[PDB]
Design a protein around this motif. Structure first.
Motif, PDB file in Angstrom:
ATOM      1  N   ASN B 380       0.841  -1.194   0.000  1.00  0.00           N
ATOM      2  CA  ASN B 380       0.000   0.000   0.000  1.00  0.00           C
ATOM      3  C   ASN B 380       0.881   1.250   0.000  1.00  0.00           C
ATOM      4  O   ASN B 380       0.958   1.994   0.976  1.00  0.00           O
ATOM      5  CB  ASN B 380      -0.931  -0.005   1.203  1.00  0.00           C
ATOM      6  CG  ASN B 380      -1.992   1.077   1.125  1.00  0.00           C
ATOM      7  OD1 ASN B 380      -2.248   1.637   0.062  1.00  0.00           O
ATOM      8  ND2 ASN B 380      -2.574   1.407   2.274  1.00  0.00           N
ATOM      9  N   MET B 381       1.565   1.478  -1.117  1.00  0.00           N
ATOM     10  CA  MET B 381       2.588   2.517  -1.167  1.00  0.00           C
ATOM     11  C   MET B 381       1.994   3.862  -1.563  1.00  0.00           C
ATOM     12  O   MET B 381       1.695   4.101  -2.736  1.00  0.00           O
ATOM     13  CB  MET B 381       3.709   2.112  -2.117  1.00  0.00           C
ATOM     14  CG  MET B 381       4.531   0.965  -1.581  1.00  0.00           C
ATOM     15  SD  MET B 381       5.813   0.416  -2.703  1.00  0.00           S
ATOM     16  CE  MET B 381       6.930   1.799  -2.626  1.00  0.00           C
ATOM     17  N   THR B 382       1.836   4.743  -0.577  1.00  0.00           N
ATOM     18  CA  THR B 382       1.470   6.140  -0.786  1.00  0.00           C
ATOM     19  C   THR B 382       2.701   7.016  -1.032  1.00  0.00           C
ATOM     20  O   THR B 382       2.936   8.004  -0.330  1.00  0.00           O
ATOM     21  CB  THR B 382       0.644   6.635   0.407  1.00  0.00           C
ATOM     22  OG1 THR B 382       0.425   8.050   0.310  1.00  0.00           O
ATOM     23  CG2 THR B 382       1.277   6.242   1.761  1.00  0.00           C
TER      24      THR B 382
HETATM   25  C1  LIG Z   1      -3.544   2.416   2.707  1.00  0.00           C
HETATM   26  O1  LIG Z   1      -4.700   1.931   3.399  1.00  0.00           O
HETATM   27  C2  LIG Z   1      -5.177   2.858   4.392  1.00  0.00           C
HETATM   28  C3  LIG Z   1      -6.344   2.194   5.084  1.00  0.00           C
HETATM   29  O2  LIG Z   1      -6.512   0.850   4.654  1.00  0.00           O
HETATM   30  C4  LIG Z   1      -5.544   4.208   3.757  1.00  0.00           C
HETATM   31  O3  LIG Z   1      -5.837   5.135   4.796  1.00  0.00           O
HETATM   32  C5  LIG Z   1      -4.400   4.749   2.904  1.00  0.00           C
HETATM   33  O4  LIG Z   1      -4.812   5.920   2.207  1.00  0.00           O
HETATM   34  C6  LIG Z   1      -3.918   3.682   1.921  1.00  0.00           C
HETATM   35  N1  LIG Z   1      -2.809   4.182   1.118  1.00  0.00           N
HETATM   36  C7  LIG Z   1      -2.919   4.607  -0.153  1.00  0.00           C
HETATM   37  C8  LIG Z   1      -4.287   4.529  -0.778  1.00  0.00           C
HETATM   38  O5  LIG Z   1      -1.950   5.010  -0.782  1.00  0.00           O
END
Ligand SMILES: *[C@@H]1O[C@H](CO)[C@@H](O)[C@H](O)[C@H]1NC(C)=O
Ligand SMILES: *[C@@H]1O[C@H](CO)[C@@H](O[C@@H]2O[C@H](CO)[C@@H](O[C@@H]3O[C@H](CO)[C@@H](O)[C@H](O)[C@@H]3O)[C@H](O)[C@H]2NC(C)=O)[C@H](O)[C@H]1NC(C)=O
Ligand SMILES: *[C@@H]1O[C@H](CO)[C@@H](O[C@@H]2O[C@H](CO)[C@@H](O[C@@H]3O[C@H](CO)[C@@H](O)[C@H](O)[C@@H]3O)[C@H](O)[C@H]2NC(C)=O)[C@H](O)[C@H]1NC(C)=O
Ligand SMILES: *[C@@H]1O[C@H](CO)[C@@H](O[C@@H]2O[C@H](CO)[C@@H](O[C@@H]3O[C@H](CO)[C@@H](O)[C@H](O)[C@@H]3O)[C@H](O)[C@H]2NC(C)=O)[C@H](O)[C@H]1NC(C)=O
Ligand SMILES: *[C@@H]1O[C@H](CO)[C@@H](O[C@@H]2O[C@H](CO)[C@@H](O[C@@H]3O[C@H](CO)[C@@H](O)[C@H](O)[C@@H]3O)[C@H](O)[C@H]2NC(C)=O)[C@H](O)[C@H]1NC(C)=O
Ligand SMILES: *[C@@H]1O[C@H](CO)[C@@H](O[C@@H]2O[C@H](CO)[C@@H](O[C@@H]3O[C@H](CO)[C@@H](O)[C@H](O)[C@@H]3O)[C@H](O)[C@H]2NC(C)=O)[C@H](O)[C@H]1NC(C)=O
Ligand SMILES: *[C@@H]1O[C@H](CO)[C@@H](O[C@@H]2O[C@H](CO)[C@@H](O[C@@H]3O[C@H](CO)[C@@H](O)[C@H](O)[C@@H]3O)[C@H](O)[C@H]2NC(C)=O)[C@H](O)[C@H]1NC(C)=O
Ligand SMILES: *[C@@H]1O[C@H](CO)[C@@H](O[C@@H]2O[C@H](CO)[C@@H](O)[C@H](O)[C@H]2NC(C)=O)[C@H](O)[C@H]1NC(C)=O
Ligand SMILES: *[C@@H]1O[C@H](CO)[C@@H](O[C@@H]2O[C@H](CO)[C@@H](O)[C@H](O)[C@H]2NC(C)=O)[C@H](O)[C@H]1NC(C)=O
Ligand SMILES: *[C@@H]1O[C@H](CO)[C@@H](O)[C@H](O)[C@H]1NC(C)=O
Ligand SMILES: *[C@@H]1O[C@H](CO)[C@@H](O)[C@H](O)[C@H]1NC(C)=O
Ligand SMILES: *[C@@H]1O[C@H](CO)[C@@H](O)[C@H](O)[C@H]1NC(C)=O
Ligand SMILES: *[C@@H]1O[C@H](CO)[C@@H](O)[C@H](O)[C@H]1NC(C)=O
Ligand SMILES: *[C@@H]1O[C@H](CO)[C@@H](O)[C@H](O)[C@H]1NC(C)=O
Ligand SMILES: *[C@@H]1O[C@H](CO)[C@@H](O)[C@H](O)[C@H]1NC(C)=O
Ligand SMILES: *[C@@H]1O[C@H](CO)[C@@H](O)[C@H](O)[C@H]1NC(C)=O
Lengths: 383, 383, 383, 383
Positions: B380-382
């Motif tokens: 889940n790479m933001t």
């Molecule tokens: C990762 O997941 C969390 C909750 O599941 C979320 O708040 C976060 O925005 C996600 N990261 C992204 C979409 O890059």
């Protein structure tokens, strides 16, 4: 007289008789006792113990029981987790530890009282790597079984960084003899040149599943890392047009070595194994060939050392054995021409990296010697 | 009151003070003794022994000395050859064995009295393999240090059999810190995307030799397999335009976890290490973060089990400990949110394969969290 | 006997000892006094004064104090604003003025009593301009430090009007050693071929900031206008694959010149400078090499003129010195093979435009001579 | 009464009369003496000395003769090598030094007792650089005369590192008025947009040689860096279709400023110069406009300071003048609307960087104001 007491730690086979390494240790002691040129004044007895081979605590207790009863050398407990527990006991108390199987020697053990009669995979993985270059391969698949098999064939995995290959490393299924979903991916991926790192009991089971698949043709070439390729029932595979290259250190082309193997099928016989396994019936594996050799190379050392006395040491109050330093140096400087050829040890670390192989391939007649490997020379293949 | 006696086997540091894992075991026992919510009725003492860590016979004697004196759990001797000797003692006598380092569990040990708090490399090598696909690599170089590092990253080596890569596996020099002839071949071979399997003490030494070479540019990308990438002096490398991706399990983004690390730099201080090593000064490694966690997860098990009594067992006359079966099941079913995140164990084999990572990369400001790995979810790479 | 009294005006170093030019003036006088072939009848004394070097009024007072006390030649006050004040005093009163640093001679001074032992930048900027054509550049960036550096390299800026280049003239930051925002624009603008017009104390500081950036690679080529490129700690930059071309007039490939430099490190030693500067420890700069030469070339003139008498002149009642015309013509017609090679002066204006350089570049071993410049010949580069 | 004694150092013209700056210093003192609003109680006398302007030793002696006789401020000796010698005398003894010409202030002089009424070329080179962007040039040729002209226009040479230009820097011939081989290369190289950094006495001579060549057409555009473009006989060039852009700080669009210039042609007249020079007859240059301004801005400071007494100082026994600190701060904080517009000084370094220009171009009628430059605003060109 001075009876010597070479001790040994072997597998506890529950249902069947004693294992092939335990028979070969009893057969090699009885051979030196009957023959009179080797040790013409002393006889050998033994103190064989049986462990689980997968329990380092049982191997550590029975190794201390042999040194409390008084032995001269321990012949290894056939397994990486068990031999490492007995190697350090033999290091602390001065007694030699004779190893006949491959084990991952980590690069930080300062242990000196061990030798390994198994052909070391730093030398064997160069023998396979020379063999894939004689055959001019450019696309190789290595299929191993357990994760330690990456340490064994690591000189072959580090080859595309030097030579022109592309390794596709695969692994056999961990729980089942159901390697057909492995072989489907190797058939769909068009992987005709395959190296198998598995025992001959398992390599016989892969060839049935490669015959049930469409993979025993004139296009597939299989190099086997095992040294017991001359133990397989190869009669269903002679006429397929396959090539099955491999090695053999067991020097079965002498009238003296084959005479011992012809005597070996007599006393071993004792309900020979299952018919639905593609192995032969009367054959000595290289696992038991190195245990016949392990008694004789140390018997060179007790021949050149007549002032030897077996002492009784304790693990709780550990003292080095009085003649442990000199007797260990006589084993590392011992030369012998046994069943597996000339037996000279590595003077640096105590391994066996200088040895003679025989490259064998499958012809229409059967497994036939087509060359000779040597670390000084290389492939002298008169194919 | 019922004082418990969690025992431990650690490194014998000759010149300097006690090691980082031995400090973290003393710091975690003293923390639970001072705090009153966890174990409000019992206190913890310890029986720390010091070994060579490379001698299985010294580790086997001092593990039997702790069980003769009477302990409740042994905190592991930090090394593959030494922990395997103590794992089998703890299996035979029922006492748990708490492991905080990675060790090759072979697929034939039927041992049940062990848990490993180190993040297992069957899960970590999938975290690297997901990370090289997010970055869309097609040409990868894995540089390991010791031959056991092939077992660690074996899910990454078996990737070109499934995905679209070509691995070129290389090894660091075994004797010297002279990896520049390695880096010359990687520079001449145009290998810009590199995975390093080495500790952070050695990864800091490679980056100096990659800066002395022309290899810290905007073209080179380095993924580090170590979890202590947030321990390196990265100030010479911020402005180079490099990317240095890695992971971090040490949850340093809480006010409660960082408060313990801010307390950690006080009592550890004691002549901080050499200035010519590119590491920081006040930092807790993940090797000592898992030993702080190892005392607390077992402290969950003694909290849920008040009828516990520490017995005195003997290795020569081995009997299972009276509460060994239930107390081992309370450790494997214990959940804890420690320094390294949530701590849940694998119900099959006792490992730690379910854990939360934090993908960190190098920016101009420094090492910055750019994602989160999870075995259920993935990257889940933001970023 | 007739003791001569060569006077000098040097820097007032407050905290540390005397400067490198003041040591070299004391070392060159003591060398001619000890040696007996040069001036076998006369000895040399001195009247060294210390100024701020940035105050023309202090330099004018102490130059008149030396001529009131009675000197034979003033060795220049090392700075453009201060030497112009002392040049006109020495012109009015007939005494020679020996210059060892570069100064903007405007095209309207009718001054005759001065020579400059520094290699003139009308010749040096042709040596750089020949060097960028040997390397076949078509895109050059000149980075200077102070605005006078445009006058120095003006034959290189007027090159796209003749040859095929495009100069992008840039300037180092005036107040700080923070040239990284300069180097970001040179990295984003893809400026791989750079000429630096700065001293070796500052060129060592740019290379750290070019190593902290991603700019020490096999793509970047740096020509240095300074003649003290053989004074830099180049050990972090040997293996980067960079090229660092430059010049050297200090003829360090003789057994006689290097013997003086090996003696130079003894008496200078006196708390060698800071370790966080990327320079060497025992080295003679070309600023002090030309002051050792300046005493000897004038010593050729006092050897060929035995009727010399030092007089006492006054600035307020200025009269030309009685032998000033002939003794100035003996300095301009003096040849000497000093530390910096052959020393012949320009017969038109009194400068030094005919001199021998040694083109040095960075190899893996270090700075290595790869050629030889000469105004008559050009680049004889045996690279 | 308290007669003040503003001193001055000017050029020694041998054949002809006093120079234009010396007339303007005599005219500005006599104007303030005749007028009664400015200084209604005090009168001004003067101590004008004549030097070579190219000899720093003659300028240093006569500056000390004025301070021994007793002056209040020295009006500068019109040249870079001579003003630097008098600037440091005025710094040491506290007396102000009023500069009306451009001089290279190096970045290391800690001098405080000087102001410069000449428009500083850090501001003027931005006025040219804004002007080449209003005209949307992409190919510019800068033609300077002496090597100091690179320091003047250095903000224009550092423009292709920021904007979209390509500068081709050229130089006028150093010895002769034979710039036709320069203009042949500019005609063959197709260089239609040219910036000239030369005086108006030399810019008039280039335009004859650009008319003798085929270079005064409707394709050639000439920006002149001089502020005396409204002093050229432009009658041969009005109908050519050329554009001759430039600046003018001399505010000749007032009835009060032009009245002083109409009075200026009377007392100056005295055999007006040669007819074969393309300049006008009755005109005040900006070199003499700033000397008329220099007396008045300091006259603001003596008006706001009635307790002033002129002392007699000595250079050999240098003491700061008793009111030197306050009187220097009243000059730097003085505002005046003179011939050249509003006169405010730079509060940091004492220069004049805030001033109003008038962009003038050549039309068919003549030189006509087509805009207005301002450092706060920029080009407000109502063309
Ligand atoms: C990762 O997941 C969390 C909750 O599941 C979320 O708040 C976060 O925005 C996600 N990261 C992204 C979409 O890059
Ligand atoms: C019983 O005697 C000795 C015990 O030491 C056994 O070793 C053999 O001893 C003989 C003479 O001492 C040698 O025989 C050699 O045989 C090889 C066959 O491989 C042959 O190439 C040589 O030319 C020589 O004839 C030798 O030292 C040794 N044999 C080996 C293989 O090392 C002997 O084998 C025992 N058995 C018999 C039947 O004698
Ligand atoms: C005792 O042990 C050492 C360590 O294993 C042995 O050194 C090894 O010797 C071989 C010589 O063949 C070295 O070179 C290798 O040769 C193959 C031949 O094809 C080639 O592929 C490479 O050149 C390869 O390096 C090998 O590197 C070297 N091992 C190490 C770690 O340096 C030594 O030979 C042994 N002593 C004996 C057998 O007497
Ligand atoms: C307890 O341990 C076992 C084995 O140690 C864990 O099973 C393992 O689960 C992972 C993830 O489900 C399997 O990995 C791979 O998953 C990815 C994506 O789903 C994919 O590339 C493969 O198809 C593979 O399934 C792994 O193979 C599997 N191991 C075995 C032997 O089946 C189990 O999850 C643990 N239980 C826990 C943490 O509760
Ligand atoms: C004494 O000084 C004068 C001027 O300071 C020296 O004259 C200069 O000589 C050089 C080389 O001959 C001229 O430079 C350029 O040469 C190259 C290649 O030959 C070429 O790019 C140009 O055509 C140019 O000629 C330089 O222009 C010239 N200076 C002047 C003002 O003419 C003279 O050589 C010195 N005498 C000595 C050292 O004996
Ligand atoms: C003699 O008197 C003063 C001496 O201080 C001179 O300065 C001028 O003084 C008057 C009133 O004090 C002002 O005149 C101004 O003229 C400008 C024209 O540029 C106009 O725009 C203003 O609205 C005002 O009328 C001013 O303070 C000052 N002039 C300037 C240019 O600053 C005066 O010029 C001398 N001469 C005469 C004939 O009065
Ligand atoms: C006193 O002196 C300082 C130093 O010269 C003056 O600072 C200078 O102010 C200008 C403001 O215009 C700075 O910006 C420049 O503006 C032009 C307008 O187009 C533009 O091309 C750039 O933004 C350029 O930088 C200038 O950088 C700055 N100089 C330095 C060295 O920082 C200051 O204004 C003077 N004080 C006054 C006039 O009151
Ligand atoms: C003492 O131990 C208790 C153990 O429960 C800690 O209390 C926990 O604190 C964390 C965050 O600080 C919370 O997320 C938990 O919910 C708390 N648990 C309970 C049961 O309240 C407490 O922080 C510790 N204090 C110190 C000073 O170590
Ligand atoms: C003393 O001075 C004389 C100056 O002549 C030096 O002699 C010269 O030495 C160099 C090399 O050392 C030769 O190339 C010259 O030909 C020599 N000249 C003469 C006339 O012999 C001598 O080296 C100096 N010695 C010391 C110790 O300084
Ligand atoms: C069998 O061996 C021969 C000899 O090397 C070779 O020509 C042939 O291709 C092999 N068959 C294979 C690789 O299927
Ligand atoms: C190679 O084999 C040939 C015949 O098989 C024979 O000359 C000898 O065994 C070997 N020759 C060498 C090693 O030079
Ligand atoms: C490295 O990270 C930067 C962000 O700092 C990103 O822009 C870039 O795509 C990454 N990869 C490479 C090869 O530069
Ligand atoms: C730099 O020097 C090397 C020799 O060290 C040479 O091979 C190369 O051509 C030079 N130029 C560049 C751009 O690397
Ligand atoms: C430079 O010239 C000298 C002699 O003039 C000669 O020895 C040398 O080889 C030349 N360099 C070359 C040809 O690269
Ligand atoms: C003269 O000025 C006008 C207005 O900017 C312009 O259109 C014309 O091209 C100029 N003539 C030149 C540049 O020769
Ligand atoms: C610009 O010029 C116009 C007309 O020439 C006039 O409004 C004023 O002088 C300037 N406007 C400004 C500076 O806003």
């Amino acid at each position: 007289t001075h009876v010597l007491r070479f001790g040994g730690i072997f597998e506890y086979v529950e249902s069947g008789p004693m294992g092939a390494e335990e028979l070969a240790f009893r057969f090699a002691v009885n051979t030196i006792n009957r023959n009179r040129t080797l040790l013409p004044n002393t006889t050998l007895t033994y103190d064989t113990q049986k462990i689980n081979l997968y329990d380092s605590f049982e191997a550590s207790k029975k190794a201390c029981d042999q040194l409390s009863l008084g032995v001269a050398a321990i012949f290894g407990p056939s397994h990486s987790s068990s031999a490492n527990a007995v190697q350090s006991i033999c290091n602390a108390l001065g007694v030699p530890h004779i190893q006949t199987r491959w084990k991952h020697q980590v690069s930080d053990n300062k242990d000196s009282f061990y030798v390994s009669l198994y052909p070391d995979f730093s030398s064997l993985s160069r023998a396979i790597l020379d063999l894939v270059q004689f055959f001019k391969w450019k696309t190789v698949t290595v299929v191993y079984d357990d994760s330690t098999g990456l340490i064994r064939l690591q000189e072959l995995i580090k080859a595309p960084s030097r030579y022109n290959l592309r390794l596709k490393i695969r692994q056999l299924p961990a729980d089942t003899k159901d390697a057909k979903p492995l072989l489907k991916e190797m058939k769909r991926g068009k992987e005709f040149h395959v190296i198998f790192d598995c025992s001959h009991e398992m390599a016989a089971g892969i060839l049935k599943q490669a015959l049930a698949m469409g993979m025993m043709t004139e296009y597939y070439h299989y190099i086997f890392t095992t040294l017991d390729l001359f133990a397989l029932d190869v009669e269903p595979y002679r006429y397929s047009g396959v090539n099955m290259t491999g090695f053999r250190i067991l020097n079965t082309e002498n009238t003296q070595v084959s005479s011992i193997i012809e005597k070996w099928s007599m006393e071993r016989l004792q309900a020979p194994p299952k018919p639905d396994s593609g192995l032969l019936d009367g054959f000595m594996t290289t696992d038991a060939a190195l245990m016949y050799d392990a008694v004789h190379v140390v018997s060179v050392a007790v021949q050149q050392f007549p002032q030897m006395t077996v002492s009784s040491l304790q693990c709780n109050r550990h003292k080095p054995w009085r003649f442990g330093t000199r007797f260990m140096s006589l084993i590392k400087e011992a030369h012998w021409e046994g069943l597996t050829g000339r037996i000279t040890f590595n003077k640096t670390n105590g391994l066996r990296t200088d040895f003679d192989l025989d490259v064998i391939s499958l012809k229409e007649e059967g497994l036939e010697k087509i060359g000779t490997w040597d670390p000084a020379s290389g492939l002298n293949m008169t194919e």
